[PDB]
Amino acid sequence: LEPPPSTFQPLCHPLVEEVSKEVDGYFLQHWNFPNEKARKKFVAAGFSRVTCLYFPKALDDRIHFACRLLTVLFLIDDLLEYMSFEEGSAYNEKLIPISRGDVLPDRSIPVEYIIYDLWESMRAHDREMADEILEPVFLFMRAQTDRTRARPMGLGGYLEYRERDVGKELLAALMRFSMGLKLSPSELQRVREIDANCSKHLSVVNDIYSYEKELYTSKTAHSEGGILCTSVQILAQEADVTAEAAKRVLFVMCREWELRHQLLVARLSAEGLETPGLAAYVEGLEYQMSGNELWSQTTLRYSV
Amino acid sequence: LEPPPSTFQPLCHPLVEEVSKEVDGYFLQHWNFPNEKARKKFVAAGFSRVTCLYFPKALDDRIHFACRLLTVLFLIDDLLEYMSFEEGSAYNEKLIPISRGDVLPDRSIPVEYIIYDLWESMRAHDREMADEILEPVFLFMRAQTDRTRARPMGLGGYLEYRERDVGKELLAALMRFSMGLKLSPSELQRVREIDANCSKHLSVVNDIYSYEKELYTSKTAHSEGGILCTSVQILAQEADVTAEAAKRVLFVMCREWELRHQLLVARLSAEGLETPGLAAYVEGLEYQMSGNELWSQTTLRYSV
Ligand SMILES: C=C(C)[C@H]1CC[C@@]2(C)CCC[C@@H](C)[N@H+]2C1
Ligand SMILES: C=C(C)[C@H]1CC[C@@]2(C)CCC[C@@H](C)[N@H+]2C1
Ligand SMILES: [Mg+2]
Ligand SMILES: [Mg+2]
Ligand SMILES: [Mg+2]
Ligand SMILES: [Mg+2]
Ligand SMILES: [Mg+2]
Ligand SMILES: [Mg+2]
């Protein structure tokens, strides 16, 4: 698979190695891994590396929070593949009041106290910015087990849904939190079109590289939890071509979204609407897109 | 618009210059043009040139029939843009019994006697093969005013419909007639996957180059007859990109359809199923795809 040229250059957080050891070490200590093979596969994925590629300009004392949140969501994402839609929904909904801090965790259940302690530590560091990540996370969690995954979709309908399932909103709120980048409601309304365009890029790039993994999962895991819901399959069905053909076409489309991003940002600046905060924000989104692609094309999570 | 690499070599019928002069001259004499500007535009389109690119291995004494048929259908196709679905249907339905030769033409009405004399001349040359073009033509004509054009369509649904509106079947029967290429029902049923794949290529290549023409038509012509119905607009809406971006992505998809064509052809002969007639047929379909692209790139019908 040869990716067409891109002008987006990825950047990684300088503290990636020490934060990786810290976060991986925490989960290896607390998370209920079934066996040693799973523990090695967990480390091999590099969940803190993708986080550091996603938010390379996060504050040095906040990047670990982002690594912890994405890591635990990665782990849960894999667990849901062996559950039904109903079981996955019950699993996630249990964690939601716990994430809010409204409900105390069962200390004998790792996922509950990991989730609880995480959000408590994040609110302790920055209460206002931490709270603004909550609902975007819950929107993503509920999209994971939405029964729309088992119903016919076109490319457009998928991308609209996948924006929630890919967690575009939580990644944006997490990025702002990790950078301490505060934007007014008016400023955020200005970049909504830019956010929507960025979401499609993150979604499809993931779909492309994670297709083989998800193909295998669809055949081996739960028929609902592991259902093959991806742009690769959808375009392949609409055009009646192979998944490999669909990947090549989708990758060209991703470059068109990169072009649109630059066009939208350029217009924002020309209209005199790009505040210093917005300028940092849109650059952060580009890091997400380039960082997502670098990690996806190199991580062992997708190659083995 | 830089076309992606293709391995197809477009061929043109050697008698293109003589037949173009003959057929253009016929329509300039008989067809009712609004003004001199329209007569220039008609010649500028080169309707016999695309026919010779579509069927480069047509028999020397049969190529002119195909040129006449496609030319009159091109002219009718433009006329229907200023009619409603109801009016357009009425226009086409009147030509159907005339095409069969069941009803005499009004010789004061050019379109009626041109259609009548043409089909009569075609049946006089080869009655059996001429008759086999009838139903594929009527199928195309009735697709032109299908009410589904006024309903939102996905990419898959469009391509399924467009196979009739693009006149895939009529082009196939016309090609066989022009080459005197007879196929058995078994041979015809055998290559239906190849036909469906070829149809998508013809359709999208046309959509790509005729988009600007049809965008303008949608703004100026009848609200029904001029309605914008194309894969370019569909992909642009679903992926939320410009029409130009959608063109570039669709063009890559066309090349994937070219790859599938070669794959399906190779599989036909890998299985014990490629007859001499089928080999000439599927090769003829390649000429249609490459010829349609070559003409669409250069014709003034699309560039102005
Ligand atoms: C596009 C990405 C990085 C996805 C990967 C899978 C995962 C479940 C990882 C944790 C975050 C959620 C939104 N989601 C992001
Ligand atoms: C893709 C082509 C060549 C179309 C162009 C428009 C037209 C009405 C021209 C005459 C033949 C019909 C099928 N149809 C073919
Ligand atoms: Mg998931
Ligand atoms: Mg997953
Ligand atoms: Mg994936
Ligand atoms: Mg038409
Ligand atoms: Mg037309
Ligand atoms: Mg067209």
Side-chain angles (χ1 to χ4, degrees):
Chain A
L1 178 58
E2 184 70 37
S6 170
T7 60
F8 291 175
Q9 193 70 12
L11 185 68
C12 190
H13 199 284
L15 300 186
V16 54
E17 180 72 7
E18 79 180 56
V19 175
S20 292
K21 298 308 185 189
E22 174 194 355
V23 178
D24 279 6
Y26 174 88
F27 282 89
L28 283 178
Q29 174 180 338
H30 294 280
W31 187 261
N32 179 29
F33 292 100
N35 43 66
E36 176 64 26
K37 183 185 180 182
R39 303 177 88 91
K40 296 198 299 295
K41 188 179 181 62
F42 167 76
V43 176
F47 291 140
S48 286
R49 168 163 151 86
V50 59
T51 306
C52 289
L53 282 165
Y54 256 76
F55 318 126
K57 291 195 176 184
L59 298 179
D60 282 5
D61 63 331
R62 287 158 94 116
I63 182 60
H64 81 91
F65 294 114
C67 290
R68 291 170 188 268
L69 182 54
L70 297 193
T71 294
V72 68
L73 292 181
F74 260 116
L75 289 170
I76 295 171
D77 185 79
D78 293 340
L79 290 182
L80 297 179
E81 292 182 326
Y82 289 92
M83 304 182 183
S84 59
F85 292 138
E86 195 80 56
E87 285 171 346
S89 179
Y91 185 92
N92 279 339
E93 292 290 338
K94 219 184 305 295
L95 302 177
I96 295 182
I98 297 183
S99 297
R100 290 195 179 101
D102 295 336
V103 167
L104 266 37
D106 193 328
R107 284 281 160 184
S108 65
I109 304 180
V111 66
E112 294 193 5
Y113 77 77
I114 289 172
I115 283 296
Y116 182 83
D117 293 344
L118 214 210
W119 286 100
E120 284 285 299
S121 68
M122 295 174 60
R123 282 189 289 271
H125 193 94
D126 197 327
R127 170 65 179 273
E128 175 185 324
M129 303 206 70
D131 285 345
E132 296 170 4
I133 315 181
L134 285 175
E135 295 295 335
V137 167
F138 303 153
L139 183 65
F140 146 80
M141 287 178 168
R142 293 177 167 129
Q144 288 185 298
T145 61
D146 196 322
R147 202 163 288 268
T148 186
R149 299 174 56 82
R151 293 194 301 264
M153 285 185 313
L155 181 60
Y158 169 77
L159 295 179
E160 201 277 344
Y161 156 77
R162 182 68 161 132
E163 177 173 335
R164 303 187 294 273
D165 182 65
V166 83
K168 171 66 185 64
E169 243 182 280
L170 84 88
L171 290 170
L174 221 204
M175 183 185 67
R176 293 185 238 112
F177 171 88
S178 71
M179 297 173 59
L181 180 58
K182 292 195 175 186
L183 300 177
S184 70
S186 180
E187 284 176 305
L188 285 168
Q189 289 163 340
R190 291 182 179 178
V191 288
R192 240 149 72 170
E193 199 173 15
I194 293 179
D195 277 330
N197 179 79
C198 175
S199 172
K200 296 176 173 59
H201 191 285
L202 298 170
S203 294
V204 176
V205 166
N206 174 272
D207 292 347
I208 290 175
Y209 286 104
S210 69
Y211 177 75
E212 289 299 320
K213 174 182 75 74
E214 295 170 358
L215 215 209
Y216 176 81
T217 295
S218 67
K219 298 172 177 172
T220 59
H222 196 284
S223 57
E224 291 187 348
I227 197 174
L228 197 59
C229 184
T230 169
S231 60
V232 175
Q233 188 278 332
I234 293 175
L235 180 57
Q237 178 167 327
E238 294 222 79
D240 198 12
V241 296
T242 67
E244 211 60 43
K247 288 187 190 178
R248 295 188 283 269
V249 176
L250 284 169
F251 230 146
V252 178
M253 176 61 73
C254 286
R255 300 305 184 235
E256 295 298 334
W257 285 325
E258 297 186 4
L259 256 41
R260 179 155 205 263
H261 172 81
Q262 295 170 331
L263 188 147
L264 289 172
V265 168
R267 186 171 83 256
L268 186 72
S269 184
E271 295 172 353
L273 303 179
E274 189 179 19
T275 56
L278 245 25
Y281 180 82
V282 297
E283 178 184 70
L285 289 183
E286 183 186 316
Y287 288 145
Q288 293 190 20
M289 284 180 287
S290 62
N292 185 48
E293 176 169 352
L294 215 208
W295 179 80
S296 299
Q297 68 193 10
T298 56
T299 183
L300 297 173
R301 174 178 175 84
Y302 302 152
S303 64
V304 34
Chain B
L1 182 67
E2 192 69 56
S6 177
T7 63
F8 290 174
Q9 173 63 259
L11 260 40
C12 186
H13 198 282
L15 293 180
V16 57
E17 295 298 330
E18 296 98 291
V19 179
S20 295
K21 208 67 177 183
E22 168 193 354
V23 177
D24 282 344
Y26 176 85
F27 282 87
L28 285 176
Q29 170 114 353
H30 297 266
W31 187 262
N32 231 96
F33 296 97
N35 51 26
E36 183 66 25
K37 182 184 181 182
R39 310 181 82 93
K40 304 271 195 56
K41 185 176 182 58
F42 167 75
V43 168
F47 292 139
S48 291
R49 170 177 151 84
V50 62
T51 307
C52 290
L53 283 166
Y54 255 77
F55 317 126
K57 292 184 176 180
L59 301 179
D60 284 9
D61 64 338
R62 285 160 93 119
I63 183 59
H64 81 90
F65 294 113
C67 291
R68 293 172 188 270
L69 181 55
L70 295 195
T71 297
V72 71
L73 292 179
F74 261 114
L75 293 169
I76 294 172
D77 181 80
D78 292 338
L79 288 179
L80 298 182
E81 293 182 327
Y82 293 93
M83 307 183 189
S84 65
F85 291 141
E86 190 171 308
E87 290 174 331
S89 179
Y91 186 92
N92 278 338
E93 288 295 335
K94 198 164 191 285
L95 301 177
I96 296 185
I98 300 184
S99 297
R100 292 194 178 105
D102 294 342
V103 175
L104 250 43
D106 191 331
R107 292 229 164 243
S108 64
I109 309 177
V111 66
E112 291 197 9
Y113 76 77
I114 288 172
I115 284 297
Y116 183 82
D117 296 350
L118 210 214
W119 285 102
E120 282 285 293
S121 66
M122 294 177 60
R123 283 186 293 271
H125 191 91
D126 195 329
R127 208 274 158 86
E128 179 184 314
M129 304 200 73
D131 283 345
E132 290 172 330
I133 315 181
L134 286 175
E135 296 296 334
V137 165
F138 304 151
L139 178 69
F140 151 77
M141 295 170 65
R142 282 152 181 166
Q144 290 178 297
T145 58
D146 197 329
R147 289 306 180 127
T148 191
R149 299 178 58 83
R151 297 195 293 267
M153 290 179 306
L155 186 54
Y158 166 78
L159 294 175
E160 194 280 330
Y161 155 74
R162 181 69 159 128
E163 179 168 353
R164 296 179 288 276
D165 180 68
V166 83
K168 175 63 184 61
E169 272 190 58
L170 95 82
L171 293 170
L174 222 203
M175 182 183 63
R176 287 183 268 127
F177 170 86
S178 72
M179 300 176 60
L181 180 60
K182 294 174 172 295
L183 299 176
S184 69
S186 176
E187 285 171 315
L188 289 168
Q189 197 273 167
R190 195 173 310 174
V191 293
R192 288 198 275 113
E193 251 188 317
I194 297 177
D195 283 326
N197 180 78
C198 171
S199 174
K200 297 177 172 56
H201 191 283
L202 295 172
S203 297
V204 175
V205 164
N206 174 272
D207 292 349
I208 287 174
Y209 286 102
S210 67
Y211 175 80
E212 301 299 331
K213 176 182 78 75
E214 295 169 359
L215 211 212
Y216 174 79
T217 293
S218 61
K219 296 172 180 169
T220 56
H222 195 277
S223 65
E224 291 185 349
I227 199 170
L228 192 61
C229 186
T230 165
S231 62
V232 175
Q233 181 62 29
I234 293 178
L235 183 57
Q237 290 173 185
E238 298 211 75
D240 201 15
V241 296
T242 63
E244 280 298 299
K247 287 180 186 179
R248 292 188 285 266
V249 176
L250 285 171
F251 225 150
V252 176
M253 177 61 72
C254 289
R255 296 304 185 242
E256 296 295 339
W257 283 325
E258 297 189 8
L259 251 42
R260 180 158 192 256
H261 172 80
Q262 299 168 335
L263 184 145
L264 290 173
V265 165
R267 191 179 78 194
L268 184 66
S269 57
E271 304 164 5
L273 300 179
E274 190 189 59
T275 65
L278 250 22
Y281 179 79
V282 299
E283 174 188 85
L285 292 185
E286 177 188 322
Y287 300 148
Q288 294 189 23
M289 288 180 283
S290 59
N292 180 64
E293 180 176 340
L294 214 215
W295 176 80
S296 298
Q297 288 173 352
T298 56
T299 182
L300 271 41
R301 174 179 175 85
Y302 299 152
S303 58
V304 331

mmCIF file of all heavy atoms in Angstrom, chain A residues 261-292:
data_model
loop_
_atom_site.group_PDB
_atom_site.id
_atom_site.type_symbol
_atom_site.label_atom_id
_atom_site.label_comp_id
_atom_site.label_asym_id
_atom_site.label_seq_id
_atom_site.Cartn_x
_atom_site.Cartn_y
_atom_site.Cartn_z
ATOM 1 N N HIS A 261 -8.760 21.233 4.123
ATOM 2 C CA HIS A 261 -8.319 21.770 5.403
ATOM 3 C C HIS A 261 -7.508 23.046 5.205
ATOM 4 O O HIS A 261 -7.762 24.058 5.858
ATOM 5 C CB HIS A 261 -7.485 20.738 6.158
ATOM 6 C CG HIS A 261 -6.833 21.274 7.395
ATOM 7 N ND1 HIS A 261 -7.504 21.415 8.591
ATOM 8 C CD2 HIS A 261 -5.567 21.699 7.620
ATOM 9 C CE1 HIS A 261 -6.679 21.904 9.500
ATOM 10 N NE2 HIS A 261 -5.499 22.086 8.939
ATOM 11 N N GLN A 262 -6.537 22.990 4.297
ATOM 12 C CA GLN A 262 -5.696 24.144 4.007
ATOM 13 C C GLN A 262 -6.502 25.291 3.406
ATOM 14 O O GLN A 262 -6.263 26.455 3.720
ATOM 15 C CB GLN A 262 -4.557 23.755 3.066
ATOM 16 C CG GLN A 262 -3.577 22.766 3.664
ATOM 17 C CD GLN A 262 -2.615 22.211 2.637
ATOM 18 O OE1 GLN A 262 -2.945 22.104 1.455
ATOM 19 N NE2 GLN A 262 -1.416 21.858 3.082
ATOM 20 N N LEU A 263 -7.457 24.954 2.543
ATOM 21 C CA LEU A 263 -8.337 25.948 1.938
ATOM 22 C C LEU A 263 -9.213 26.628 2.989
ATOM 23 O O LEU A 263 -9.369 27.848 2.981
ATOM 24 C CB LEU A 263 -9.204 25.301 0.849
ATOM 25 C CG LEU A 263 -10.066 26.199 -0.045
ATOM 26 C CD1 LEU A 263 -10.180 25.596 -1.435
ATOM 27 C CD2 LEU A 263 -11.453 26.409 0.547
ATOM 28 N N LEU A 264 -9.787 25.833 3.890
ATOM 29 C CA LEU A 264 -10.644 26.370 4.944
ATOM 30 C C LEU A 264 -9.867 27.239 5.930
ATOM 31 O O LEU A 264 -10.348 28.293 6.353
ATOM 32 C CB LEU A 264 -11.360 25.239 5.690
ATOM 33 C CG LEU A 264 -12.455 24.509 4.911
ATOM 34 C CD1 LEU A 264 -12.940 23.288 5.675
ATOM 35 C CD2 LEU A 264 -13.611 25.449 4.608
ATOM 36 N N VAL A 265 -8.669 26.794 6.294
ATOM 37 C CA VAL A 265 -7.821 27.552 7.210
ATOM 38 C C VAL A 265 -7.391 28.878 6.581
ATOM 39 O O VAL A 265 -7.402 29.921 7.236
ATOM 40 C CB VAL A 265 -6.580 26.733 7.637
ATOM 41 C CG1 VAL A 265 -5.559 27.617 8.336
ATOM 42 C CG2 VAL A 265 -6.984 25.571 8.536
ATOM 43 N N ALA A 266 -7.025 28.825 5.304
ATOM 44 C CA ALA A 266 -6.594 30.010 4.569
ATOM 45 C C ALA A 266 -7.702 31.058 4.480
ATOM 46 O O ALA A 266 -7.436 32.257 4.548
ATOM 47 C CB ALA A 266 -6.111 29.629 3.176
ATOM 48 N N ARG A 267 -8.943 30.602 4.328
ATOM 49 C CA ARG A 267 -10.074 31.520 4.257
ATOM 50 C C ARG A 267 -10.357 32.132 5.624
ATOM 51 O O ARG A 267 -10.741 33.298 5.723
ATOM 52 C CB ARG A 267 -11.327 30.822 3.716
ATOM 53 C CG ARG A 267 -12.494 31.773 3.479
ATOM 54 C CD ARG A 267 -13.653 31.115 2.740
ATOM 55 N NE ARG A 267 -14.530 30.356 3.629
ATOM 56 C CZ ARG A 267 -14.536 29.031 3.721
ATOM 57 N NH1 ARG A 267 -13.710 28.310 2.977
ATOM 58 N NH2 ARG A 267 -15.370 28.426 4.556
ATOM 59 N N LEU A 268 -10.161 31.341 6.673
ATOM 60 C CA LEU A 268 -10.364 31.807 8.038
ATOM 61 C C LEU A 268 -9.414 32.959 8.353
ATOM 62 O O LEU A 268 -9.801 33.943 8.984
ATOM 63 C CB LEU A 268 -10.144 30.663 9.029
ATOM 64 C CG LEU A 268 -10.455 30.960 10.497
ATOM 65 C CD1 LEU A 268 -11.957 31.063 10.721
ATOM 66 C CD2 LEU A 268 -9.839 29.906 11.407
ATOM 67 N N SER A 269 -8.171 32.828 7.902
ATOM 68 C CA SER A 269 -7.157 33.852 8.125
ATOM 69 C C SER A 269 -7.423 35.095 7.281
ATOM 70 O O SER A 269 -7.265 36.220 7.752
ATOM 71 C CB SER A 269 -5.766 33.299 7.819
ATOM 72 O OG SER A 269 -4.762 34.255 8.108
ATOM 73 N N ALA A 270 -7.823 34.879 6.032
ATOM 74 C CA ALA A 270 -8.085 35.977 5.106
ATOM 75 C C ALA A 270 -9.256 36.839 5.566
ATOM 76 O O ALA A 270 -9.253 38.054 5.375
ATOM 77 C CB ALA A 270 -8.332 35.443 3.702
ATOM 78 N N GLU A 271 -10.253 36.207 6.178
ATOM 79 C CA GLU A 271 -11.415 36.925 6.690
ATOM 80 C C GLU A 271 -11.111 37.593 8.031
ATOM 81 O O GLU A 271 -11.972 38.252 8.613
ATOM 82 C CB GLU A 271 -12.614 35.980 6.824
ATOM 83 C CG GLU A 271 -13.128 35.429 5.498
ATOM 84 C CD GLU A 271 -14.180 34.347 5.668
ATOM 85 O OE1 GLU A 271 -14.424 33.922 6.817
ATOM 86 O OE2 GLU A 271 -14.762 33.916 4.649
ATOM 87 N N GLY A 272 -9.884 37.420 8.511
ATOM 88 C CA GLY A 272 -9.455 38.001 9.771
ATOM 89 C C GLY A 272 -10.109 37.355 10.978
ATOM 90 O O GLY A 272 -10.325 38.006 12.001
ATOM 91 N N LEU A 273 -10.421 36.068 10.863
ATOM 92 C CA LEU A 273 -11.134 35.361 11.921
ATOM 93 C C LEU A 273 -10.260 34.349 12.661
ATOM 94 O O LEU A 273 -10.719 33.685 13.590
ATOM 95 C CB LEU A 273 -12.370 34.665 11.348
ATOM 96 C CG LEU A 273 -13.362 35.574 10.616
ATOM 97 C CD1 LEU A 273 -14.534 34.770 10.077
ATOM 98 C CD2 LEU A 273 -13.847 36.692 11.527
ATOM 99 N N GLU A 274 -9.001 34.233 12.248
ATOM 100 C CA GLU A 274 -8.087 33.293 12.886
ATOM 101 C C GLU A 274 -7.348 33.928 14.060
ATOM 102 O O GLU A 274 -6.281 34.517 13.892
ATOM 103 C CB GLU A 274 -7.084 32.723 11.880
ATOM 104 C CG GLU A 274 -6.254 31.570 12.440
ATOM 105 C CD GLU A 274 -5.271 30.999 11.435
ATOM 106 O OE1 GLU A 274 -4.955 31.691 10.447
ATOM 107 O OE2 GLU A 274 -4.815 29.853 11.634
ATOM 108 N N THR A 275 -7.927 33.799 15.247
ATOM 109 C CA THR A 275 -7.299 34.263 16.477
ATOM 110 C C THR A 275 -6.061 33.419 16.772
ATOM 111 O O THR A 275 -5.909 32.334 16.208
ATOM 112 C CB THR A 275 -8.281 34.156 17.657
ATOM 113 O OG1 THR A 275 -8.746 32.806 17.766
ATOM 114 C CG2 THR A 275 -9.467 35.081 17.444
ATOM 115 N N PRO A 276 -5.164 33.920 17.642
ATOM 116 C CA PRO A 276 -3.988 33.133 18.037
ATOM 117 C C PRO A 276 -4.364 31.762 18.592
ATOM 118 O O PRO A 276 -3.652 30.788 18.345
ATOM 119 C CB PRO A 276 -3.354 33.994 19.130
ATOM 120 C CG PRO A 276 -3.718 35.384 18.752
ATOM 121 C CD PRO A 276 -5.106 35.292 18.181
ATOM 122 N N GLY A 277 -5.470 31.689 19.325
ATOM 123 C CA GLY A 277 -5.950 30.426 19.855
ATOM 124 C C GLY A 277 -6.418 29.490 18.758
ATOM 125 O O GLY A 277 -6.131 28.294 18.785
ATOM 126 N N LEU A 278 -7.141 30.038 17.786
ATOM 127 C CA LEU A 278 -7.640 29.254 16.664
ATOM 128 C C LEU A 278 -6.489 28.775 15.786
ATOM 129 O O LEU A 278 -6.522 27.666 15.253
ATOM 130 C CB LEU A 278 -8.636 30.079 15.843
ATOM 131 C CG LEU A 278 -10.089 29.601 15.802
ATOM 132 C CD1 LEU A 278 -10.443 28.776 17.031
ATOM 133 C CD2 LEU A 278 -11.026 30.794 15.673
ATOM 134 N N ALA A 279 -5.467 29.615 15.646
ATOM 135 C CA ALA A 279 -4.287 29.266 14.857
ATOM 136 C C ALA A 279 -3.553 28.068 15.457
ATOM 137 O O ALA A 279 -3.074 27.191 14.733
ATOM 138 C CB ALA A 279 -3.351 30.461 14.742
ATOM 139 N N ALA A 280 -3.468 28.038 16.785
ATOM 140 C CA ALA A 280 -2.851 26.923 17.494
ATOM 141 C C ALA A 280 -3.728 25.679 17.403
ATOM 142 O O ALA A 280 -3.228 24.556 17.341
ATOM 143 C CB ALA A 280 -2.606 27.291 18.952
ATOM 144 N N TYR A 281 -5.038 25.892 17.394
ATOM 145 C CA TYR A 281 -5.998 24.801 17.339
ATOM 146 C C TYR A 281 -5.950 24.072 15.998
ATOM 147 O O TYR A 281 -5.867 22.846 15.956
ATOM 148 C CB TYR A 281 -7.412 25.324 17.608
ATOM 149 C CG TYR A 281 -8.475 24.251 17.566
ATOM 150 C CD1 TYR A 281 -8.714 23.443 18.669
ATOM 151 C CD2 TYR A 281 -9.238 24.048 16.425
ATOM 152 C CE1 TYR A 281 -9.686 22.459 18.635
ATOM 153 C CE2 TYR A 281 -10.208 23.068 16.381
ATOM 154 C CZ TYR A 281 -10.429 22.278 17.488
ATOM 155 O OH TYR A 281 -11.396 21.300 17.448
ATOM 156 N N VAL A 282 -5.998 24.831 14.908
ATOM 157 C CA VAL A 282 -6.012 24.243 13.571
ATOM 158 C C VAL A 282 -4.686 23.563 13.238
ATOM 159 O O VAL A 282 -4.651 22.602 12.467
ATOM 160 C CB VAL A 282 -6.377 25.275 12.482
ATOM 161 C CG1 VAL A 282 -7.788 25.798 12.707
ATOM 162 C CG2 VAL A 282 -5.373 26.417 12.456
ATOM 163 N N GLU A 283 -3.599 24.057 13.825
ATOM 164 C CA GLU A 283 -2.305 23.406 13.680
ATOM 165 C C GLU A 283 -2.315 22.093 14.451
ATOM 166 O O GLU A 283 -1.742 21.097 14.011
ATOM 167 C CB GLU A 283 -1.183 24.311 14.187
ATOM 168 C CG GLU A 283 0.204 23.683 14.106
ATOM 169 C CD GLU A 283 1.282 24.567 14.700
ATOM 170 O OE1 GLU A 283 1.306 24.735 15.939
ATOM 171 O OE2 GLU A 283 2.109 25.090 13.927
ATOM 172 N N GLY A 284 -2.979 22.099 15.602
ATOM 173 C CA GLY A 284 -3.119 20.901 16.409
ATOM 174 C C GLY A 284 -3.899 19.820 15.684
ATOM 175 O O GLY A 284 -3.591 18.634 15.808
ATOM 176 N N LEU A 285 -4.911 20.229 14.923
ATOM 177 C CA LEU A 285 -5.707 19.284 14.144
ATOM 178 C C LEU A 285 -4.872 18.636 13.046
ATOM 179 O O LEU A 285 -5.051 17.460 12.731
ATOM 180 C CB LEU A 285 -6.930 19.969 13.532
ATOM 181 C CG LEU A 285 -8.058 20.391 14.478
ATOM 182 C CD1 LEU A 285 -9.214 20.983 13.678
ATOM 183 C CD2 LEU A 285 -8.528 19.224 15.335
ATOM 184 N N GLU A 286 -3.967 19.410 12.460
ATOM 185 C CA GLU A 286 -3.089 18.881 11.425
ATOM 186 C C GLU A 286 -2.137 17.841 12.009
ATOM 187 O O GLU A 286 -1.813 16.847 11.356
ATOM 188 C CB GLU A 286 -2.307 20.007 10.754
ATOM 189 C CG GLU A 286 -1.432 19.538 9.610
ATOM 190 C CD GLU A 286 -0.571 20.647 9.052
ATOM 191 O OE1 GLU A 286 -1.094 21.767 8.870
ATOM 192 O OE2 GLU A 286 0.630 20.403 8.806
ATOM 193 N N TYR A 287 -1.694 18.069 13.243
ATOM 194 C CA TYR A 287 -0.842 17.111 13.939
ATOM 195 C C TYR A 287 -1.591 15.807 14.184
ATOM 196 O O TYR A 287 -1.015 14.721 14.089
ATOM 197 C CB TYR A 287 -0.345 17.688 15.267
ATOM 198 C CG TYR A 287 0.696 18.776 15.117
ATOM 199 C CD1 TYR A 287 0.735 19.850 15.996
ATOM 200 C CD2 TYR A 287 1.643 18.724 14.102
ATOM 201 C CE1 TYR A 287 1.683 20.845 15.865
ATOM 202 C CE2 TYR A 287 2.598 19.717 13.963
ATOM 203 C CZ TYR A 287 2.613 20.775 14.849
ATOM 204 O OH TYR A 287 3.557 21.767 14.722
ATOM 205 N N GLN A 288 -2.876 15.921 14.503
ATOM 206 C CA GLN A 288 -3.715 14.747 14.692
ATOM 207 C C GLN A 288 -3.778 13.919 13.419
ATOM 208 O O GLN A 288 -3.618 12.702 13.455
ATOM 209 C CB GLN A 288 -5.123 15.152 15.117
ATOM 210 C CG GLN A 288 -5.189 15.780 16.491
ATOM 211 C CD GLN A 288 -6.611 15.952 16.965
ATOM 212 O OE1 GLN A 288 -7.527 15.298 16.464
ATOM 213 N NE2 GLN A 288 -6.809 16.835 17.934
ATOM 214 N N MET A 289 -3.999 14.590 12.293
ATOM 215 C CA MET A 289 -4.128 13.910 11.009
ATOM 216 C C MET A 289 -2.831 13.244 10.552
ATOM 217 O O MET A 289 -2.838 12.091 10.123
ATOM 218 C CB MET A 289 -4.633 14.878 9.936
ATOM 219 C CG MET A 289 -6.122 15.179 10.026
ATOM 220 S SD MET A 289 -6.691 16.320 8.752
ATOM 221 C CE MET A 289 -6.003 17.866 9.343
ATOM 222 N N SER A 290 -1.722 13.972 10.650
ATOM 223 C CA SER A 290 -0.423 13.442 10.252
ATOM 224 C C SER A 290 0.075 12.414 11.260
ATOM 225 O O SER A 290 0.674 11.406 10.881
ATOM 226 C CB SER A 290 0.604 14.569 10.085
ATOM 227 O OG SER A 290 0.821 15.246 11.311
ATOM 228 N N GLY A 291 -0.174 12.672 12.539
ATOM 229 C CA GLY A 291 0.225 11.750 13.589
ATOM 230 C C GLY A 291 -0.545 10.440 13.520
ATOM 231 O O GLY A 291 0.026 9.366 13.738
ATOM 232 N N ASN A 292 -1.839 10.530 13.219
ATOM 233 C CA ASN A 292 -2.676 9.349 13.067
ATOM 234 C C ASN A 292 -2.159 8.450 11.954
ATOM 235 O O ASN A 292 -2.116 7.225 12.096
ATOM 236 C CB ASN A 292 -4.117 9.757 12.768
ATOM 237 C CG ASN A 292 -5.063 8.571 12.725
ATOM 238 O OD1 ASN A 292 -5.049 7.720 13.614
ATOM 239 N ND2 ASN A 292 -5.889 8.509 11.685
#
